[PDB]
DNA sequence: GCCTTGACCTTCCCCTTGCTGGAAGGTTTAACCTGTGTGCAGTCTGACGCGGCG
């Protein structure tokens, strides 16, 4: 439960939904990133990606 | 300090043995209330407005 | 306006007394740096004029 | 207040003692109900100063009338609490240790000085190899390194009449042995024979370093530590927020463990226990 | 990056050489890595993790 | 080069400000060094007047005071 | 002796016993090197008297007089 | 051949710095020793300390003997505490009575009284008196050594040599450094007499051009010999036997020293096993391990071996106590003493079960009444339990902010308030100067204005003069002239103050 | 406005019984049990230094 709750609530992925407009909601749901674990970092990146 | 000490020597009235921590509206902000809520422990007395 | 203490207080009470005057000091953070390096075995100090 | 210039140098043990007000002895910070300092801890008001403007620990002395008075009940001096910032403390140690900068940076400045490699010195300090202070005989040489088994070989060859050791204090007495002066003149004239590339460069570097030690008044054995300073508290605080939880500068941790190991060592030293445990505790201290 | 096994090659980091340097990598979901590669001087080499 | 022309300076406090502080403090410490506040940067740290602009007029005076006791 | 054994024999507790002791109303039992109140039989029966005297109603002082007679 | 492994690996250690590898590589050298190492090492320790208790016989020097300490223990009319349980106590080859002790302490006092006057008999080590001494000893040898107080008795001999030895050094401190002196000659005749000034001219018989210049410090060289002499006066023997006694107990204790080492090295892997069971992430490895090592030391320090059991388990639980204590004393910025700790541990063990069974976290009342104690203590324990929170924690999701930025010094000052106080003070003494000098001044000392201190009815009065009640009425009329709705208005603002 | 003059209030501290409760702090148990690690960290990267190795 510890690992699960800290994941759902302290990672860099669990973001507060944006209730500006429904568009904000659904496009924030239909996101893709490439950051975080098993992932990238801006200093480790260039331009080809 | 001796100065306000002297002042209360003139007038006499004091503070009690309790102080204020009252909440207030922040500076510059204004508006209208439409709701309140209370969350209270189990076993503790729910007061009048509670 | 940042660090000196005597100066900020004194000038507040000067300009409220219709005086546009200055009385600086020497900031705190410099002395903080001094203490921090004296933590390390350093005999830093200050030479008189 | 006003002045002209700045000066920099290493700090001798006498001076760091002078700077301090009272030694520290144990890692206690505060009581879990009476959030107040203990004695000879890290926040002891006796060393650092009062908690507030002209208030002692218990409250014996206040209101400016007992100006330079110390509260003999606890032993706390009465002044502002503005000296949370100023009064730094100190510590005595059991065995000395090395300042990491003055060996482990690029150029070591000390193995450099002695022409000695780096790994030899590490293998000394982590207690993997003895080394000669001084070869009392014409057999052996200074700076000569020994494994423990071959140390024993030479031991049962001689036993008494040499000087070798494993640890840091070895290096203390070692560099306390040498002299700047005649070695400087040596390398001065030694330059003249072959002023070829590496000869010239290294001789240059060393002679300059030596001369810098010479005229500066500094001394090399001051580059290691029988003493430490203790930074004042409010630069390393321990403070609540409104919810009641105390925040803590992680530095506090770095200090507190140190103390305990030191005095833990003084337990074992008061038993003359096997040197193995002693060795690994020294290692731990250096690492800390 | 998906798991599996990837190939690639660099454009002579020994630009002295100015020559291609092939290498190859495996990637599990979980565990340890490997890396095969050529040196400039025509020899295979290997490194874990 | 630029960076090491900055580092290799007759003072160090500007030098000890932007690159590889550790080495700088180490080399300065052994020799018994001392700065005499001729640059700008150092006079900024302390908070004194810079020896320039409006303030040259005063720092020159303090220089002849170094001459005049 | 050990102390709890004696106090569970006589019903008292170490706290009440030490009150009585501080009142100087019985023999002072010695300690040990560790600090355990070294009781005896004399201390046992003196304690029994000092107990039953206030039960009878002879007060602290008067029960102490009964005790110093028990020594006499 | 484990040091040979150190040789090669060190010859190509990959610049390792971790002491963990170092310590484990070192302790792995000396291998275990089982099922007879225990017993034969115990019997070596037996040999050592019983060579000591043999040495413990025959002290004309340490005349203060267990006879004397037996006068001590019964000096205050009684003792049954453990001082006697360390005393004579014959083991089969338990508070002692007075009868049993007086019986056991009679024959050794008999040997005392008969054994001394015979030492005079034509030699201190005369065969008849010396075999009487041997009876005293051998009679004491079936009996056991006696407790820590006997260390004083050994130290009471150390303090002899601590002086005696030192005095020779002290004499040497006046003798051997300043002028030339031989050393193939000095020791031999220093052993020769050692009692009177006889070897002096015997050594100067070489005619020694350095020796004749024995002046200007010699009234300290011979007065340093005189310290040795007045010690010969103090003791009463020219030692050659009790020095041998020092050798005897020296090797006898050294026996044990060397002995229980290899008991230490025997059982270190036990320590790391225990520790890494306890390495649940409270503190750190090595300090725990070192604590296990002191653990093992005191385990061996008092090991009965005739219980038949294996050393391991006895030692093991003593180790457990050491580390579970030290983890409690340390591992927090906040010292929480032990009983609160164990309460917490108990409590959490309980609540685990409670949330098995209820499918939920428990309520304080519930597990409290199961824990048989009222809610207040539980609640306070919970208020107290959690750790601090690391000032430099990043409240900023990225490295944009640390927590140490967003707090304030809610202690120091405020400038407007300083000006407030200053203007108030100006107004106050402005008002004072409008009133009479004596009255205003008397009020300054009454209330401490413009001075360090404060004074009261009788102090201020009898500084001025005796008056008490009319003084009160004087400050009252001072208020009356001061109430006065012309002067308040410079201070009416400070009614809000 | 100087002296009291006696009589009155209020507060703080200390003191008597017969213990009780609680905190803070100490020292010993015999079936036994012997070599981490433990999840990192994904390899940025170009100049400039420097150490061994030719
Ligand atoms: Zn106080």
mmCIF file of C-alpha atoms in Angstrom, chain H residues 285-487:
data_model
loop_
_atom_site.group_PDB
_atom_site.id
_atom_site.type_symbol
_atom_site.label_atom_id
_atom_site.label_comp_id
_atom_site.label_asym_id
_atom_site.label_seq_id
_atom_site.Cartn_x
_atom_site.Cartn_y
_atom_site.Cartn_z
ATOM 1 C CA UNK H 285 25.774 -1.302 9.143
ATOM 2 C CA UNK H 286 29.232 -0.800 10.589
ATOM 3 C CA UNK H 287 28.425 0.953 13.851
ATOM 4 C CA UNK H 288 25.943 -1.831 14.569
ATOM 5 C CA UNK H 289 28.653 -4.358 13.749
ATOM 6 C CA UNK H 290 31.172 -2.705 16.069
ATOM 7 C CA UNK H 291 28.563 -2.768 18.783
ATOM 8 C CA UNK H 292 28.214 -6.473 18.152
ATOM 9 C CA UNK H 293 31.946 -6.746 18.673
ATOM 10 C CA UNK H 294 31.859 -5.137 22.122
ATOM 11 C CA UNK H 295 28.917 -7.480 22.541
ATOM 12 C CA UNK H 296 31.039 -10.524 21.939
ATOM 13 C CA UNK H 297 33.814 -9.142 24.141
ATOM 14 C CA UNK H 298 31.716 -8.936 27.254
ATOM 15 C CA UNK H 299 30.086 -12.248 26.386
ATOM 16 C CA UNK H 300 33.461 -13.952 26.543
ATOM 17 C CA UNK H 301 34.562 -11.810 29.485
ATOM 18 C CA UNK H 302 32.344 -13.794 31.883
ATOM 19 C CA UNK H 303 31.782 -17.180 30.247
ATOM 20 C CA UNK H 304 31.102 -20.244 32.340
ATOM 21 C CA UNK H 305 32.258 -23.204 30.258
ATOM 22 C CA UNK H 306 31.186 -26.053 32.533
ATOM 23 C CA UNK H 307 27.530 -25.509 31.692
ATOM 24 C CA UNK H 308 28.395 -27.662 28.667
ATOM 25 C CA UNK H 309 26.462 -25.438 26.269
ATOM 26 C CA UNK H 310 27.889 -23.795 23.191
ATOM 27 C CA UNK H 311 29.245 -20.260 23.604
ATOM 28 C CA UNK H 312 27.153 -19.030 20.693
ATOM 29 C CA UNK H 313 23.781 -18.614 22.314
ATOM 30 C CA UNK H 314 24.776 -17.001 25.600
ATOM 31 C CA UNK H 315 26.875 -14.545 23.657
ATOM 32 C CA UNK H 316 24.111 -14.089 21.097
ATOM 33 C CA UNK H 317 21.486 -12.740 23.430
ATOM 34 C CA UNK H 318 23.989 -10.449 25.125
ATOM 35 C CA UNK H 319 24.768 -9.113 21.632
ATOM 36 C CA UNK H 320 21.062 -8.643 20.966
ATOM 37 C CA UNK H 321 20.773 -6.512 24.069
ATOM 38 C CA UNK H 322 23.759 -4.390 23.118
ATOM 39 C CA UNK H 323 22.540 -3.492 19.661
ATOM 40 C CA UNK H 324 18.852 -3.141 20.501
ATOM 41 C CA UNK H 325 19.886 -0.762 23.252
ATOM 42 C CA UNK H 326 22.226 1.333 21.137
ATOM 43 C CA UNK H 327 19.755 1.577 18.252
ATOM 44 C CA UNK H 328 17.379 3.048 20.807
ATOM 45 C CA UNK H 329 19.825 5.498 22.353
ATOM 46 C CA UNK H 330 20.907 6.745 18.925
ATOM 47 C CA UNK H 331 19.232 6.874 15.483
ATOM 48 C CA UNK H 332 17.276 10.053 16.202
ATOM 49 C CA UNK H 333 17.824 13.760 16.431
ATOM 50 C CA UNK H 334 15.362 13.425 19.306
ATOM 51 C CA UNK H 335 16.369 11.238 22.221
ATOM 52 C CA UNK H 336 13.346 9.116 23.058
ATOM 53 C CA UNK H 337 14.172 6.899 26.063
ATOM 54 C CA UNK H 338 13.643 3.234 25.864
ATOM 55 C CA UNK H 339 10.276 2.617 27.427
ATOM 56 C CA UNK H 340 8.518 4.901 24.993
ATOM 57 C CA UNK H 341 10.289 3.021 22.216
ATOM 58 C CA UNK H 342 9.127 -0.398 23.316
ATOM 59 C CA UNK H 343 5.623 0.943 23.840
ATOM 60 C CA UNK H 344 5.633 2.130 20.229
ATOM 61 C CA UNK H 345 6.907 -1.227 19.026
ATOM 62 C CA UNK H 346 4.237 -3.091 20.978
ATOM 63 C CA UNK H 347 1.579 -0.735 19.689
ATOM 64 C CA UNK H 348 2.463 -1.174 16.045
ATOM 65 C CA UNK H 349 2.648 -4.961 16.369
ATOM 66 C CA UNK H 350 -0.880 -4.746 17.723
ATOM 67 C CA UNK H 351 -2.255 -2.444 15.059
ATOM 68 C CA UNK H 352 -1.000 -4.761 12.335
ATOM 69 C CA UNK H 353 -3.289 -7.466 13.704
ATOM 70 C CA UNK H 354 -6.105 -4.996 14.121
ATOM 71 C CA UNK H 355 -5.939 -4.113 10.426
ATOM 72 C CA UNK H 356 -5.754 -7.734 9.485
ATOM 73 C CA UNK H 357 -8.981 -8.346 11.194
ATOM 74 C CA UNK H 358 -11.040 -5.173 10.694
ATOM 75 C CA UNK H 359 -10.087 -4.611 7.064
ATOM 76 C CA UNK H 360 -9.197 -1.123 8.262
ATOM 77 C CA UNK H 361 -6.879 0.955 10.312
ATOM 78 C CA UNK H 362 -7.956 0.748 13.973
ATOM 79 C CA UNK H 363 -9.518 3.375 16.220
ATOM 80 C CA UNK H 364 -7.462 4.662 19.192
ATOM 81 C CA UNK H 365 -10.132 3.697 21.706
ATOM 82 C CA UNK H 366 -10.279 0.114 20.428
ATOM 83 C CA UNK H 367 -6.661 -0.943 20.467
ATOM 84 C CA UNK H 368 -6.142 1.221 23.550
ATOM 85 C CA UNK H 369 -8.727 -0.637 25.613
ATOM 86 C CA UNK H 370 -7.201 -3.821 24.250
ATOM 87 C CA UNK H 371 -3.854 -2.372 25.327
ATOM 88 C CA UNK H 372 -5.358 -1.586 28.730
ATOM 89 C CA UNK H 373 -4.594 2.120 29.022
ATOM 90 C CA UNK H 374 -6.462 5.363 28.340
ATOM 91 C CA UNK H 375 -6.660 7.306 25.109
ATOM 92 C CA UNK H 376 -4.607 10.286 26.286
ATOM 93 C CA UNK H 377 -1.300 8.409 26.390
ATOM 94 C CA UNK H 378 -1.947 6.801 23.016
ATOM 95 C CA UNK H 379 -2.756 10.160 21.503
ATOM 96 C CA UNK H 380 0.372 11.755 22.907
ATOM 97 C CA UNK H 381 2.536 8.868 21.688
ATOM 98 C CA UNK H 382 1.088 9.487 18.250
ATOM 99 C CA UNK H 383 1.687 13.232 18.527
ATOM 100 C CA UNK H 384 5.303 12.500 19.402
ATOM 101 C CA UNK H 385 6.340 9.681 17.141
ATOM 102 C CA UNK H 386 7.190 11.110 13.729
ATOM 103 C CA UNK H 387 10.675 12.207 12.683
ATOM 104 C CA UNK H 388 11.904 15.512 11.251
ATOM 105 C CA UNK H 389 11.597 16.495 7.666
ATOM 106 C CA UNK H 390 14.892 17.556 6.100
ATOM 107 C CA UNK H 391 15.032 21.355 5.536
ATOM 108 C CA UNK H 392 16.438 20.975 2.018
ATOM 109 C CA UNK H 393 13.551 18.839 0.782
ATOM 110 C CA UNK H 394 12.312 20.054 -2.634
ATOM 111 C CA UNK H 395 8.770 21.332 -2.189
ATOM 112 C CA UNK H 396 9.410 22.437 -5.743
ATOM 113 C CA UNK H 397 8.575 19.556 -8.055
ATOM 114 C CA UNK H 398 11.835 20.326 -9.859
ATOM 115 C CA UNK H 399 14.918 22.131 -8.512
ATOM 116 C CA UNK H 400 13.183 25.502 -8.568
ATOM 117 C CA UNK H 401 12.668 25.747 -4.808
ATOM 118 C CA UNK H 402 13.801 24.239 -1.552
ATOM 119 C CA UNK H 403 11.773 24.289 1.625
ATOM 120 C CA UNK H 404 14.317 26.472 3.415
ATOM 121 C CA UNK H 405 13.244 29.452 1.297
ATOM 122 C CA UNK H 406 9.578 29.704 2.288
ATOM 123 C CA UNK H 407 9.870 30.327 6.039
ATOM 124 C CA UNK H 408 10.346 33.481 8.062
ATOM 125 C CA UNK H 409 12.144 34.745 11.126
ATOM 126 C CA UNK H 410 9.109 35.218 13.356
ATOM 127 C CA UNK H 411 11.295 36.236 16.273
ATOM 128 C CA UNK H 412 13.356 39.287 15.596
ATOM 129 C CA UNK H 413 11.924 42.815 15.379
ATOM 130 C CA UNK H 414 9.831 45.162 13.360
ATOM 131 C CA UNK H 415 10.928 48.672 12.315
ATOM 132 C CA UNK H 416 7.584 50.438 12.643
ATOM 133 C CA UNK H 417 7.354 48.939 16.123
ATOM 134 C CA UNK H 418 10.754 50.353 17.010
ATOM 135 C CA UNK H 419 9.624 53.799 15.901
ATOM 136 C CA UNK H 420 6.394 53.241 17.832
ATOM 137 C CA UNK H 421 8.258 52.528 21.047
ATOM 138 C CA UNK H 422 10.652 55.424 20.525
ATOM 139 C CA UNK H 423 7.882 57.969 19.919
ATOM 140 C CA UNK H 424 5.955 56.598 22.886
ATOM 141 C CA UNK H 425 8.988 57.114 25.089
ATOM 142 C CA UNK H 426 9.440 60.668 23.828
ATOM 143 C CA UNK H 427 5.786 61.407 24.572
ATOM 144 C CA UNK H 428 6.084 59.875 28.029
ATOM 145 C CA UNK H 429 9.052 61.842 29.308
ATOM 146 C CA UNK H 430 7.717 64.957 27.602
ATOM 147 C CA UNK H 431 4.695 64.451 29.848
ATOM 148 C CA UNK H 432 7.006 63.840 32.809
ATOM 149 C CA UNK H 433 8.844 67.140 32.415
ATOM 150 C CA UNK H 434 5.505 68.942 32.685
ATOM 151 C CA UNK H 435 5.137 67.620 36.228
ATOM 152 C CA UNK H 436 7.299 68.239 39.287
ATOM 153 C CA UNK H 437 10.903 67.008 39.324
ATOM 154 C CA UNK H 438 10.796 64.957 42.531
ATOM 155 C CA UNK H 439 7.542 63.199 41.629
ATOM 156 C CA UNK H 440 8.582 62.374 38.064
ATOM 157 C CA UNK H 441 12.005 61.135 39.200
ATOM 158 C CA UNK H 442 10.477 59.061 42.001
ATOM 159 C CA UNK H 443 8.247 57.508 39.352
ATOM 160 C CA UNK H 444 11.242 56.844 37.088
ATOM 161 C CA UNK H 445 12.852 54.811 39.851
ATOM 162 C CA UNK H 446 9.488 53.350 40.852
ATOM 163 C CA UNK H 447 9.044 52.024 37.303
ATOM 164 C CA UNK H 448 12.642 51.950 36.080
ATOM 165 C CA UNK H 449 12.488 54.649 33.426
ATOM 166 C CA UNK H 450 15.820 55.720 31.957
ATOM 167 C CA UNK H 451 17.751 53.327 34.215
ATOM 168 C CA UNK H 452 18.614 49.636 34.455
ATOM 169 C CA UNK H 453 16.583 48.692 37.496
ATOM 170 C CA UNK H 454 13.232 48.957 39.279
ATOM 171 C CA UNK H 455 12.349 49.958 42.830
ATOM 172 C CA UNK H 456 9.276 49.909 44.994
ATOM 173 C CA UNK H 457 7.429 51.420 47.951
ATOM 174 C CA UNK H 458 9.951 50.982 50.742
ATOM 175 C CA UNK H 459 13.165 51.073 48.696
ATOM 176 C CA UNK H 460 12.315 54.326 46.923
ATOM 177 C CA UNK H 461 10.750 55.809 50.045
ATOM 178 C CA UNK H 462 13.600 55.155 52.439
ATOM 179 C CA UNK H 463 16.004 56.336 49.764
ATOM 180 C CA UNK H 464 14.002 59.558 49.916
ATOM 181 C CA UNK H 465 12.423 59.176 53.379
ATOM 182 C CA UNK H 466 10.277 56.810 55.407
ATOM 183 C CA UNK H 467 6.783 57.645 54.105
ATOM 184 C CA UNK H 468 4.596 54.757 52.897
ATOM 185 C CA UNK H 469 0.863 55.533 52.578
ATOM 186 C CA UNK H 470 1.114 59.186 51.658
ATOM 187 C CA UNK H 471 3.655 58.082 49.040
ATOM 188 C CA UNK H 472 0.867 55.977 47.547
ATOM 189 C CA UNK H 473 -1.416 58.997 47.697
ATOM 190 C CA UNK H 474 1.346 61.131 46.144
ATOM 191 C CA UNK H 475 1.550 58.939 43.075
ATOM 192 C CA UNK H 476 -2.258 58.932 43.111
ATOM 193 C CA UNK H 477 -2.437 62.729 42.879
ATOM 194 C CA UNK H 478 0.253 62.410 40.224
ATOM 195 C CA UNK H 479 -2.296 60.400 38.241
ATOM 196 C CA UNK H 480 -4.928 63.026 39.083
ATOM 197 C CA UNK H 481 -2.819 65.841 37.640
ATOM 198 C CA UNK H 482 -2.018 63.445 34.795
ATOM 199 C CA UNK H 483 -5.521 62.172 33.967
ATOM 200 C CA UNK H 484 -6.235 65.718 33.007
ATOM 201 C CA UNK H 485 -7.817 65.725 29.505
ATOM 202 C CA UNK H 486 -5.118 67.912 27.896
ATOM 203 C CA UNK H 487 -2.104 65.585 28.229
#
